[PDB]
Design a protein around this ligand. Sequence first.
Ligand SMILES: [Zn+2]
Length: 195
Amino acid sequence: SVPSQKTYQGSYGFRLGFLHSGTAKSVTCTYSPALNKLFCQLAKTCPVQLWVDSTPPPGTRVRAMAIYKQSQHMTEVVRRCPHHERCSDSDGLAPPQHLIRVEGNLRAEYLDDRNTFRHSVVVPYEPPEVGSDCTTIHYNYMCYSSCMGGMNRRPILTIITLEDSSGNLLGRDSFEVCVCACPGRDRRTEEENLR
Ligand SMILES: [Zn+2]
């Protein structure tokens, strides 16, 4: 099958947020609202904010999953390429085949769906702390969009779902991702081609 990618704020008014990092040649992660696309370097921190109008129940979780954006590739499981799945750079929790990892959260769980074979990483939803208005999850993408035998230049979408303790849908948002050597220049080039 194919995971839904329909934006759904749900009962708790769930939606994502991104920092404003700019497009300098040196930037490691930058988000383009015009393209709803995140550009980031390989295995660098990608801060993703979680915004809600009201706090969801204890036990609520947040899942991240990648799918190919192009319909002709949608049924293919997004995974790391033959080279990166074998480079032994595991952090001791993420399976080596998984494209998306969560940084600094010992409660992250990695799932290999026994039915769809798709990969995902899920963490408990934590309400914002004192002085903060949102919660931030730090993601890492472990393969370049251009990796041969892997994404092979095919664009991907990351789908973030807010789920209850049973895995039922409470909210959903998504964004395109391009893991590349120079996020600042590529974002500028793509926004130009759009203009
Ligand atoms: Zn790779």
